[PDB]
Design a protein around this nucleic acid. Structure first.
Lengths: 44, 45, 45, 44
DNA sequence: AGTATAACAGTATATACT
DNA sequence: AGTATAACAGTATATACT
């Protein structure tokens, strides 16, 4: 299976996370989100 | 502004992540990921 | 069906609860309370 | 100050929590929610 | 696979009766 | 104070280009 999910982050609501996603080299985005999750999980 | 990005996590390749998103309380997916990144980010630079 | 109930927690009477709800991630209030009760409930009967 | 919040629980989505709120004697509802929170908090 | 874009409960408030 | 009721991002999907 697969879990699809559309995430939206907002300019004024969360700037830094916004800037982050917007400058990550295209082709690595999912990789990160995935990583950020990988840790966020153990780190729980 | 808004960044839209749809991600797909495949059951097989990364079970734990899949399993996670798939079983988080209703209406927490965006919150969680949003949290995960927040922490990830500064953890880096 | 649906149960609607609006609660009000006063800063003074129960600071900690107030402070909590007031600083939980966006779109998690219903989830959290929903969680709190879930646990509360069976903890009882 | 005060924090107001309208919570809605659904029949088919979460039955037990639904039944609970629906049978608690009227005048004690907030008291509980508040209690459930009181613990949910320390218990964190 | 990663990415770019394109229709149906929480959140916030308010009035009013016990 | 507790309670009863009354308008504006997440969630889910899909198509399509690299």
């Amino acid at each position: 299976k697969e879990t699809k999910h559309l995430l939206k982050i907002k300019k004024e609501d969360y700037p830094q996370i916004f800037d982050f996603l917007e400058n990550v080299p295209r082709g690595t985005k999912t990789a990160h989100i995935r990583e950020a999750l990988r840790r966020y999980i153990e780190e729980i």
